[PDB]
Write a protein that holds these residues in place. Structure first.
Motif, mmCIF file in Angstrom:
data_model
loop_
_atom_site.group_PDB
_atom_site.id
_atom_site.type_symbol
_atom_site.label_atom_id
_atom_site.label_comp_id
_atom_site.label_asym_id
_atom_site.label_seq_id
_atom_site.Cartn_x
_atom_site.Cartn_y
_atom_site.Cartn_z
ATOM 1 N N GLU A 1 0.800 -1.329 0.103
ATOM 2 C CA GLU A 1 -0.017 0.018 0.014
ATOM 3 C C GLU A 1 0.863 1.302 0.001
ATOM 4 N N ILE A 2 1.989 1.196 0.466
ATOM 5 C CA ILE A 2 2.705 2.550 0.870
ATOM 6 C C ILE A 2 3.763 2.704 -0.258
ATOM 7 N N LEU A 3 4.261 1.735 -0.651
ATOM 8 C CA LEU A 3 5.688 2.053 -1.402
ATOM 9 C C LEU A 3 5.158 2.606 -2.969
ATOM 10 N N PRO A 4 4.157 2.183 -3.819
ATOM 11 C CA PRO A 4 3.874 2.449 -5.043
ATOM 12 C C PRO A 4 3.630 4.007 -5.162
ATOM 13 N N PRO A 5 2.725 4.669 -4.069
ATOM 14 C CA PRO A 5 2.555 5.915 -4.068
ATOM 15 C C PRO A 5 3.530 6.961 -3.683
ATOM 16 N N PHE A 6 4.266 6.284 -2.628
ATOM 17 C CA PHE A 6 5.434 7.171 -2.270
ATOM 18 C C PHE A 6 6.372 7.357 -3.356
ATOM 19 N N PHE A 7 6.875 6.154 -4.329
ATOM 20 C CA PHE A 7 7.958 6.292 -5.259
ATOM 21 C C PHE A 7 7.261 7.025 -6.619
ATOM 22 N N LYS A 8 6.063 6.875 -6.589
ATOM 23 C CA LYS A 8 5.356 7.565 -7.741
ATOM 24 C C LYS A 8 5.518 9.282 -7.495
ATOM 25 N N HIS A 9 5.107 9.452 -6.257
ATOM 26 C CA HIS A 9 5.048 10.991 -5.948
ATOM 27 C C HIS A 9 6.101 11.909 -5.364
ATOM 28 N N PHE A 10 7.139 11.063 -4.724
ATOM 29 C CA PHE A 10 8.321 11.982 -4.132
ATOM 30 C C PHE A 10 9.536 11.776 -4.834
ATOM 31 N N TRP A 11 9.717 10.766 -5.750
ATOM 32 C CA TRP A 11 10.891 10.521 -6.288
ATOM 33 C C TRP A 11 10.901 11.348 -7.709
ATOM 34 N N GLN A 12 10.938 12.444 -7.765
ATOM 35 C CA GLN A 12 11.096 13.212 -8.982
ATOM 36 C C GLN A 12 12.202 14.587 -8.797
ATOM 37 N N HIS A 13 12.853 14.866 -9.720
ATOM 38 C CA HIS A 13 14.048 15.867 -9.415
ATOM 39 C C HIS A 13 13.674 17.068 -8.722
ATOM 40 N N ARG A 14 12.198 17.459 -9.031
ATOM 41 C CA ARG A 14 11.800 18.479 -8.070
ATOM 42 C C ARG A 14 12.134 18.392 -6.892
ATOM 43 N N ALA A 26 14.724 17.004 -5.758
ATOM 44 C CA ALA A 26 16.181 17.182 -5.575
ATOM 45 C C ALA A 26 16.626 18.378 -5.582
ATOM 46 N N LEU A 27 16.046 19.483 -6.337
ATOM 47 C CA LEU A 27 16.413 20.874 -6.218
ATOM 48 C C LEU A 27 15.581 21.344 -4.942
ATOM 49 N N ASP A 28 14.701 20.767 -4.176
ATOM 50 C CA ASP A 28 14.093 21.287 -2.977
ATOM 51 C C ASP A 28 15.234 20.744 -2.053
ATOM 52 N N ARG A 29 15.829 21.715 -1.508
ATOM 53 C CA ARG A 29 17.010 21.177 -0.592
ATOM 54 C C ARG A 29 16.465 21.198 0.665
ATOM 55 N N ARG A 30 15.129 21.628 1.087
ATOM 56 C CA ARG A 30 14.361 21.679 2.408
ATOM 57 C C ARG A 30 14.105 20.204 2.739
ATOM 58 N N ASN A 31 13.549 19.443 1.927
ATOM 59 C CA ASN A 31 12.969 18.210 2.223
ATOM 60 C C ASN A 31 13.819 17.123 1.528
ATOM 61 N N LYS A 65 20.957 6.556 -13.819
ATOM 62 C CA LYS A 65 21.201 7.340 -15.373
ATOM 63 C C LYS A 65 20.184 8.298 -15.313
ATOM 64 N N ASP A 66 20.693 9.667 -15.406
ATOM 65 C CA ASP A 66 19.730 10.583 -15.413
ATOM 66 C C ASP A 66 20.339 11.792 -16.061
ATOM 67 N N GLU A 67 19.485 12.664 -16.655
ATOM 68 C CA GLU A 67 19.728 14.137 -17.185
ATOM 69 C C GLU A 67 20.392 15.135 -16.135
ATOM 70 N N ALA A 68 19.578 15.031 -14.899
ATOM 71 C CA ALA A 68 20.020 15.980 -13.891
ATOM 72 C C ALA A 68 21.067 15.079 -13.014
ATOM 73 N N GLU A 69 21.975 15.955 -12.515
ATOM 74 C CA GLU A 69 22.980 15.288 -11.681
ATOM 75 C C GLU A 69 22.702 15.506 -10.253
ATOM 76 N N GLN A 70 21.836 16.517 -9.781
ATOM 77 C CA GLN A 70 21.175 16.707 -8.638
ATOM 78 C C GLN A 70 20.533 15.285 -8.133
ATOM 79 N N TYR A 71 19.428 14.794 -9.042
ATOM 80 C CA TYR A 71 18.844 13.407 -8.830
ATOM 81 C C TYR A 71 19.721 12.458 -8.786
ATOM 82 N N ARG A 72 20.978 12.553 -9.437
ATOM 83 C CA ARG A 72 22.090 11.344 -9.372
ATOM 84 C C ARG A 72 22.459 11.178 -7.992
#
Ligand code: SJT
Ligand code: ZN
Ligand code: ZN
Ligand code: ZN
Lengths: 66, 441, 815, 209, 81, 111
Positions: free
Chosen positions: C320-333, C335-340, C369-376
């Motif tokens: 129940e928890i992993l699909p929505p967690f990884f679908k909603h929180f793991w984006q480079h947005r 990564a550039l968000d330094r707070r969270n 393997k990603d275009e943004a290095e922050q997310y890397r």
RNA sequence: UAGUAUCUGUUCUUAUCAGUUUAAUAUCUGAUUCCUCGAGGA
RNA sequence: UGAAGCUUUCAUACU
């Protein structure tokens, strides 16, 4: 000088002797098998020997000179 | 010449004894101290056998042993003060069967010394402070806390020194989550060293001093100090807070006194004597040990004299004030160094010499005809009672102890081939000659 | 007179700019003076000086202590001024300085203890209903301090009354805030009063005002956080309203209620924890899509808190928890968000610590393997944290291939030299171990390409990687192109950048410290002569690595170099023993030991004696250290005859040098000296009989070091013999000689025992001359402070006189 | 047969000879330490084992040649005796006896204590065993310190420094350490834990049970 | 010149200049027991500073083996005033 | 109000330990009693000497500190044998003339 | 740089008591016209 | 037979 039991060039016999009597009584209270020896020798309970030593702690060797 | 030392049979004499939930479960265990050995025992509530779980050589002189527990915890700790200049806190690990050292705090030089603490050890009944004390001027207080992982933290010591002062006994006082208090029997000898007539040595009284630790301000202060009627031995913590008043019992020569700070008067009770006693009439009577048993409905004490007579002490109270002390003869057992009253109804007696005993407390309450003495009873003249065989206790177990060994001879006095050990041991009418053989029986 | 007392209470300047002795003197005297001075003038002058805009920290501390002491004495006379003091010190409680807050709280505590509860309440009650929000916060913090000082049950009635006030919602809000601040300030000490506080504040969760509900939820959360892992039967009347509210509320109040739920869940049992989690979990899943970057932080904290309990099991989590967690929180947005960002990393690591490393690691490893290095960098951080906390038991052929390809591609695609990729590469290879055989050719090609060129900041990172991975590199019987790498590292020995040279030397050392000299292809005879000029470089890393390399070569490949060069290298190393970095000295000691063990003690000892004869002080001291090192590595049986043969030379300052060398030798070898005390005893006798002050001072130093070196080894005969010659020097006036004599006596107190020392002091303790008594009582006090307990068994018998009893009778008992 | 050994309450030991034809008791040797002797045991013609009120055991041996024939230097006797052994036990010994405990074993010195303890002191016969046990004691003094904060070497040196005794009660605590520390200790002695355990059991079963 | 007030939990520190030499007997051979200092000497801006020269501390201060043998580690806070 | 030497010699159990200055002490009876304890070496004897300690005579000329027999047998004064140096140092080791605890050293005691 | 040590030089009536101090001295403080060859000494 | 101390303007050496 701040440690109790140390002396100096004006220390008298009485102060020296009461110091060693007092730390002898404390050493008897501390060591478990010395108190056993005394309590077997004089046929008393160990609590009684401890209380007697504490009571003797106050004025060992009698009152001072002059 | 080079020698190798081996121990064949460890010491079996007991110096101190504490009880508690040292494994964290609901069963109770006893920790006893030999001279240089620490030992955990567990009496079986099904058969009444006492089993030894763990025994460790500490290579020192144990001088004081306490148990304490933090609020909300289910496991008891062990505080040890020894002839080193350190205070140690230990925890029993049931899955590893060993003692794990939690804390070590160094405060002075090693050895059994006059002014270095380690002889007296008191703990706050709620477990938030511990006091270590020497026979002379030095006293130290440590604050005990807990972090978010439920591990024990220790603070830096607070000093309560007072020159030219002797200490007879220190106990923690039970307050209702108020500032921790410690009571001490103290004596000042400064005046006695300056009077050559010898009259300042006499006319010198014990004081009952109270030390308050202010956790908000982080310092120890002398609050109350009162001179006593005569010189007393050890003190007894009275359970306070919401179950009982909050004072102390002072055991003395021929008397027992209740005392509390505030508006509470002093209450004295003389110690009863055996009817038609054959002992020298000049001798007094003191208590040698005590045992408290607290219940969610009531509490009482068990104190033993030098003759081996255990009396049951109860306290007649008001909303806050104590009005009477009542004494009742309970039983006669050998003179003990420590007594532990266990839940599930067992009394453990560790004697000063010879075998130790575990008793079943057979008769709870007191439905009997024998008289009950009181502090309210008038007497110009002392109370008298008649000693009798065991009525409230039943003997369940007996632990052998060779202390004290006084003479030994190794010889083949039987016509085996292996020699036997002939040991003259024991003191008083409990002495005996014991033959030791290597083997099982 | 009025300014009378002012001019005399300038004692506070006596203290402020004053000496510590007069500081404490004026402190005590002003404490005695306070009751008569009166609180009026005292405060009228001190509160301005405490309000001084540029006061110091410790001046403030001393002022606070003065306040404490002058407040303890004058107890009930401070009442008419309390209000005033508060307006000065109700700030300092929201100050960004921690110690300012501690001092303000201490002042308010001593003020509340001096005055009474009724006075504090009567002065603080008018500002309960104030509209300025800045006042209602200091008021609540001061009420919390007063509750901590005077106790909670003393304030419980005022609290119970104030948050039932139907007059205004501000009073209720401030009362609930007082309870919250009490919790925040006192922590786990509120546990006996938990139920009282909870029943006092519980009716606010259903108020008609929305600010009261929010502050009540925050107070419940504060109490639950102060109570943890206990306190749950006191939180029973709040479970129904809190969950009905999270079911009906939406927004800021919903966030407060959810924070309360999250702090309350870890206190329950499996049933309630399991049952309550389901409800708050459907609500939280709905709230996964809301906007504020505060809401995300709270949701992450609650997820981490709840997923760490036993009532929640890995099955429900992965289902129940992993699909929505990884679908909603793991984006480079994210990564550039330094707070969270750190919050997300910690939540993911603590999720993997329960559900298993494989699933998390896969779900994010496809994203390496990603275009943004922050997310890397984010994925790399999370992956290496999970790997370090769990290791990599479940890596599959497919997962191993993907990991290796990903870390290789990430290494090459690197703009700035970072420690992240370095540590990731290192720990991945170190966890794989002997499993990475062909990616060893691949990794060697990669590090060869990185080490070939590009500014030496890539080269030093490649050298660090080699240094940290050479173990597993050779661990698989592949050295050869290992030698290909060593050749290139050798060619990279002339570098203008010392930082890169340090890494190069470290990599070379890590190689040779696992590559056999037979098969270490660059011939040892060629390398070493190229290496000896680098020993004169002045960089610390270069020096340490060069010395370590020469030491390894001398330890294993001693055969190839013709000697003479070893002698030159050791004579050059002699000067590094004075280096002002412990590392350099440690490595120099090690390398000198190795070279001495290699070339033999005879020639180096002859050279060291010649060098000790002719040089200045520091070089002679270093030579003494070197002689001690040679004598420890090659047994002192090889050094002592040649050193004693040099004492036979007839010259002064020559015997004193021999004595200083013997002193440091015994101090340096310690326990090894037990076999050599009989050999130096006649020399020490002669020196102790020597008229020269240095000869006796240095002989005493030797005696002290020898005594403390052998202890528990049965050398008491020679030490008593030497004490018989040391003791007559106690009547010496020269300070250095008497200092050395005291040192030797305190060493003999340990080696020989306190009984002998007391036997030497007894007849002088009571001598008629005051000089003898002074000296003997100094020695006796030194013997008494150490081993006071042993002396109990050693004191002589002293008979009773007519007045006093001196026999210790207990020790005369005979069982 | 020839000599008499006297124990003083505060002095340690006096050696006396009885002159059979002259009818004389002559003091020919004494000690240089005050000892509160509780008991004494003769080990051979020249050596005496003593005990103390304060919990110490000591061995004293007469010097070579001597005289035997006598017809003060420290306000005492002209000849002195040397102390070759010092050990603090921690409990007061009241019985000392040389005997063999097991059939077909070796002679040991059995002592008895006021707390009910029984112990032995056994001699080493080779230098290798002595060195191995010395290294075991050295390494166990550091990596397994006493539980209540005491220094092991300082405790056995309570009144006098230790001399020529290995504490086998510290050494047998090796069998109760955790396997990681047992390996760290054993790999310094160039040995495995089972070999160390067997070596510890060998010396015990050689003398006692 | 020594503070010597009974100490506590603060750990004494040494600066880079003398790192590794005893604070009591200023010696260059074998460290043994960690140095503890009084609370006043570690209070406020004094935390982590060198127990000899009040400068920045980079390593833990130690008593040498000879000092611990002679129980010179039990004499109180060795911060030099 | 102070003893004389002959008067104090009559009171003490051991008169031969009494000396000139012993009657000038603050407690001569305790001083003489401690001087008679069955141990306790006396004071270094040069406390009253105005020539301080050691020194005094530079007349005597002393030869270089002679090496021990075995070390002087090692033939140290080119092929060097190590095993000979080792075996000889340990196997050839001898014990030098030690002195008793009571014995003390004085300026004229080396002749 | 400024501390120590070693040579050189000096080193205080063969006249009497008391006091401070000293282990005891030491130090310090007070009192007790004649002879010889313009002269010297007492 | 012996007792070589104290001081400085010396002068000379070592830290
Ligand atoms: C000038 O600064 C000072 C004086 C003060 C300071 C504390 O501030 C400064 O940190 C300190 C640092 C440098 C120096 C000179 C001090 C300590 C070092 O000295 C060196 C001169 C010795 N040399 C030796 O130890 C001899 C041998 C070697 C190799 O060691 C060992 C363990 O074998 C001893 C010591 C290691 O020195
Ligand atoms: Zn300090
Ligand atoms: Zn520093
Ligand atoms: Zn040191």
């Amino acid at each position: 000088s701040k440690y109790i039991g140390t002396g100096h060039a004006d220390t008298t016999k009485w102060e020296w002797l009461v110091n060693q009597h007092r730390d002898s009584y404390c050493s008897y209270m501390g060591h478990f098998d010395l108190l056993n020896y005394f309590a077997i020798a004089e046929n008393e309970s160990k609590a009684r020997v401890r209380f007697n030593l504490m009571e003797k702690m106050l004025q060992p060797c009698g009152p001072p000179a002059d | 010449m080079f020698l190798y030392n081996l121990t064949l049979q460890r010491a079996t004499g007991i110096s101190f004894a504490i009880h508690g939930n040292f494994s964290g479960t609901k069963q109770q265990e006893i920790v006893v101290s030999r001279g240089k050995i620490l030992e955990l025992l567990r009496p079986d509530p099904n058969t009444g056998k006492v089993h030894t779980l763990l025994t460790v050589e500490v290579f020192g002189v144990i001088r004081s042993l306490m148990a304490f527990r933090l609020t909300g915890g289910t496991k008891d700790y062990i505080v040890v003060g020894s002839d080193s200049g350190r205070i140690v806190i230990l925890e029993y690990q049931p899955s590893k069967n060993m003692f794990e050292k939690i804390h070590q705090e160094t405060f002075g030089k090693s050895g059994c010394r006059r002014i270095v603490p380690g002889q007296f050890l008191a703990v706050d009944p709620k477990g938030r402070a511990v006091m270590i004390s020497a026979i002379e001027k030095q006293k130290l207080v440590y604050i005990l806390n807990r972090d978010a992982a439920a591990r024990l933290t220790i603070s830096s010591p607070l000093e309560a020194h007072k020159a030219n002062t002797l200490v007879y006994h220190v106990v923690g006082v039970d307050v209702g989550f108020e500032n921790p208090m410690f009571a001490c029997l103290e004596m000042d000898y400064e005046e006695a060293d300056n009077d050559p007539t010898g009259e300042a040595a006499a006319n010198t009284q014990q004081t009952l001093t109270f030390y308050e630790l202010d956790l908000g301000l982080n310092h120890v202060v002398r609050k109350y100090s009162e001179p006593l009627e005569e010189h007393g031995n050890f003190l007894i913590t009275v359970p306070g807070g919401s179950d009982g008043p909050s004072g102390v019992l002072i055991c003395s020569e021929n008397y027992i006194t209740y005392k509390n700070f505030g508006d509470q008067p002093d209450i004295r009770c003389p110690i009863p004597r055996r009817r038609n006693d054959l002992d020298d009439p000049e001798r007094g009577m003191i208590f040698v040990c005590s045992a408290t048993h607290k219940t969610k409905s009531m509490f009482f004490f068990l104190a033993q004299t030098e003759q081996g007579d255990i009396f049951k002490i109860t306290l007649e109270t008001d909303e806050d004030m104590v009005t009477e002390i009542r004494l009742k003869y309970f039983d006669t057992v050998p003179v003990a160094a420590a007594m532990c009253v266990l839940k599930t109804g067992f009394l453990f007696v560790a004697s000063e010499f010879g075998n130790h005993y575990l008793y079943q407390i057979a008769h709870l309450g007191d439905d009997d005809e024998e008289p009950e003495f009181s502090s309210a009873m008038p007497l110009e003249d002392t109370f008298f009672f008649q000693p009798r065989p065991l009525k409230n206790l039943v003997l369940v177990d007996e632990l052998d102890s060779l202390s004290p060994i006084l003479f030994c001879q190794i010889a083949d006095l039987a016509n085996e081939d292996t020699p036997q050990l002939y040991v003259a041991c024991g003191r008083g009418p409990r002495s005996s000659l014991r033959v030791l053989r290597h083997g099982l029986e | 007179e009025e300014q009378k007392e002012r001019k005399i209470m300038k004692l506070l300047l006596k203290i402020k700019n004053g000496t510590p002795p007069m500081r404490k003197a004026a402190l005590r005297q002003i404490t005695d003076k306070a009751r008569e001075f009166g609180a009026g003038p005292l405060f009228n002058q001190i509160l301005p000086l405490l309000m001084s805009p540029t006061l110091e920290d410790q001046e403030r501390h001393l002022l606070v202590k003065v306040i404490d002491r002058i407040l303890y004495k004058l107890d009930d006379l401070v009442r008419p001024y309390v209000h005033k003091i508060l307006v000065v010190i109700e700030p300092l409680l929201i100050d960004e300085d921690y110690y300012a807050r501690v001092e303000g709280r201490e002042i308010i505590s001593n003020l509340a203890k001096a005055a009474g509860l009724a006075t504090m309440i009567s002065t603080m009650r008018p500002d309960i209903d104030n509209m300025d929000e800045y006042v209602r916060n200091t008021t609540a913090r001061a009420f919390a301090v007063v509750a901590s000082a005077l106790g909670i049950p003393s304030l419980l009635p005022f609290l119970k009354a104030v948050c039932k006030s139907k007059k205004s919602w501000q009073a209720r809000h401030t009362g609930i805030k007082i309870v919250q601040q009490i919790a925040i300030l006192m922590g786990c000490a509120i546990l006996p009063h938990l139920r009282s506080l909870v029943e006092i504040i519980e009716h606010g969760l259903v108020d008609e005002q929305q600010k009261v509900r929010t502050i009540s939820a925050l107070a419940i959360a504060a109490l639950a956080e102060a109570a943890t892992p206990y306190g749950i039967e006191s939180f029973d009347s709040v479970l129904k309203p809190l969950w009905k509210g999270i079911r009906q509320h939406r927004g800021k109040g919903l966030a407060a209620f959810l924070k309360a739920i999250g702090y309350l869940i870890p206190l329950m049992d499996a049933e309630y924890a399991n049952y309550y989690t389901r409800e708050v979990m459907l609500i939280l899943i709905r709230e996964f899509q809301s906007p504020d970057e505060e809401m995300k932080k709270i949701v992450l904290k609650v997820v981490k808190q709840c997923c760490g309990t036993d009532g929640v099991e890995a099955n429900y989590i992965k289902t129940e928890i992993l699909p929505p967690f990884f679908k909603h929180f793991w984006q480079h947005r994210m990564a550039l968000d330094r707070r969270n960002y750190r919050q997300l990393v910690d939540t993911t690591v603590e999720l993997a610590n329960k559900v298993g490393a494989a699933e998390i690691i896969s779900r994010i490893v496809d994203d390496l393997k990603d275009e943004a290095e922050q997310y890397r960098k984010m994925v790399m951080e999370t992956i290496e944290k999970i790997m370090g906390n769990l290791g990599a038991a479940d890596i599959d052929h497919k997962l191993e291939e993907q990991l290796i390809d990903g870390i290789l591609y990430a290494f090459q695609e690197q703009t700035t030299e970072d420690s992240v990729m370095l540590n990731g590469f290192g720990t991945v290879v170190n966890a794989l171990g002997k499993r990475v055989k062909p990616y060893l050719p691949q990794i060697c090609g990669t590090v060869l390409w990185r080490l070939n060129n590009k500014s030496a900041k890539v080269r030093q990172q490649a050298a660090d990687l080699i240094s940290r991975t050479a173990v597993v590199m050779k661990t698989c019987q592949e050295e050869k192109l290992m030698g290909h790498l060593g050749v290139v590292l050798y060619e990279y020995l002339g570098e203008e950048y010392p930082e890169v040279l340090g890494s190069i030397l470290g990599a070379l050392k890590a190689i040779v410290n696992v590559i056999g000299m037979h098969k270490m292809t660059p011939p040892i005879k060629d390398l070493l002569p190229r290496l000896t000029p680098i020993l004169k470089n002045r960089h610390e890393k270069v020096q340490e690595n060069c010395i370590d390399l020469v030491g390894r070569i001398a330890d294993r490949g001693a055969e190839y170099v013709s000697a003479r060069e070893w002698m030159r290298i050791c004579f050059e190393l002699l000067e590094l023993l004075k280096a002002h970095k412990k590392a350099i000295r440690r490595a120099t000691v090690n390398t000198f030991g190795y070279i001495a063990k290699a070339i033999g003690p005879h020639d180096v000892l002859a050279t060291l004696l010649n060098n000790l004869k002719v040089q200045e002080r520091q070089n002679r001291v270093c030579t003494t250290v070197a002689i001690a090192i040679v004598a420890e590595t090659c047994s002192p049986f090889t050094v002592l005859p040649a050193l004693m043969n040099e004492y036979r030379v007839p010259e002064l300052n020559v015997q004193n040098g021999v004595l200083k060398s013997l002193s440091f030798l015994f101090e340096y070898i310690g326990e090894m000296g037990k076999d050599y005390i009989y050999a130096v005893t006649p020399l020490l006798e002669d020196a102790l009989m020597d008229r020269d002050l240095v000869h006796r001072q240095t002989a005493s130093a030797v005696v002290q070091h020898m005594s403390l070196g052998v202890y528990g080894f049965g050398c008491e005969d020679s030490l008593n013999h030497l004490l018989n010659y040391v003791w007559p020097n106690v009547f010496e006036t020269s300070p250095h000689v008497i200092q050395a004599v005291m040192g030797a006596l305190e060493g003999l107190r340990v080696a020989i025992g306190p009984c002998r020392m007391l036997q030497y002091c007894l007849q002088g303790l009571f001598h008629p001359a005051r000089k003898v008594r002074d000296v003997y009582w100094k020695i006796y006090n030194s013997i008494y402070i150490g081993s006071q307990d042993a002396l109990i068994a050693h004191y002589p018998r002293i008979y009773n006189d007519d007045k006093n009893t001196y026999i210790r009778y207990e020790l005369d008992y005979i069982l | 047969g020839h000599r008499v050994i006297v124990s003083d309450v505060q002095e340690s030991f006096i050696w006396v000879r009885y002159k059979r034809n002259e009818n004389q008791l002559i003091i020919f040797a004494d000690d240089t330490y005050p000892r509160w002797v509780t008991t004494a045991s003769l080990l051979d013609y020249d050596t005496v084992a003593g005990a103390d009120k304060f919990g110490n055991i000591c061995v004293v041996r007469l010097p070579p040649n001597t005289n035997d024939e006598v017809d003060g230097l420290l306000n005492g006797a002209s000849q002195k005796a040397e102390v070759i052994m010092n050990y603090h036990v921690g409990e007061t010994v009241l019985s000392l006896q040389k005997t063999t405990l097991i059939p077909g074993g070796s002679e040991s010195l059995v002592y008895t204590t006021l707390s009910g303890g029984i112990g032995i002191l056994v001699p080493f016969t080779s230098h290798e065993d002595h060195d191995f046990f010395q290294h075991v004691e050295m390494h166990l003094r550091s990596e397994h310190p006493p539980l209540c904060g005491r220094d092991h070497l300082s405790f056995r040196s309570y009144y006098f420094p230790v001399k020529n005794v290995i504490d086998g009660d510290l050494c047998e605590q090796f069998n109760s350490m955790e396997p990681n520390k047992q390996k760290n200790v054993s790999e310094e002695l160039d040995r495995t834990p089972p070999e160390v355990s067997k070596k510890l059991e060998d010396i015990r079963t050689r003398y006692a049970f | 010149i020594f503070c010597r007030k009974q100490a506590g939990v603060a750990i004494g520190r040494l600066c880079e200049k003398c790192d590794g030499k005893c604070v009591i007997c200023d010696s260059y051979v074998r460290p043994c027991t960690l140095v503890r200092i009084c609370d006043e000497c570690n209070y406020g801006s004094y935390q982590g500073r060198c127990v000899i020269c009040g400068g920045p501390g980079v390593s833990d201060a130690y008593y040498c083996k000879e000092c611990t043998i002679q129980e010179k580690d039990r004499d109180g806070c060795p911060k030099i005033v | 109000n102070r003893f004389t030497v002959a008067e104090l010699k009559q009171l003490v159990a051991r008169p031969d330990v009494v000396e000139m200055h012993d009657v000038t002490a603050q407690d001569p009876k305790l001083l003489v009693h401690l001087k008679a304890t069955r141990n306790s070496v006396p004071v270094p004897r040069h406390w009253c000497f105005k020539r301080k300690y050691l020194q005094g005579k530079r007349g005597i000329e002393k030869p270089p500190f002679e090496l021990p027999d075995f070390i002087k047998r090692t033939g140290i004064q080119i092929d060097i044998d190590y095993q000979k140096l080792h075996d000889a140092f340990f196997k050839w080791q001898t014990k030098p003339k030690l002195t008793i605890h009571g014995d003390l050293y004085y300026e004229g005691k080396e002749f």
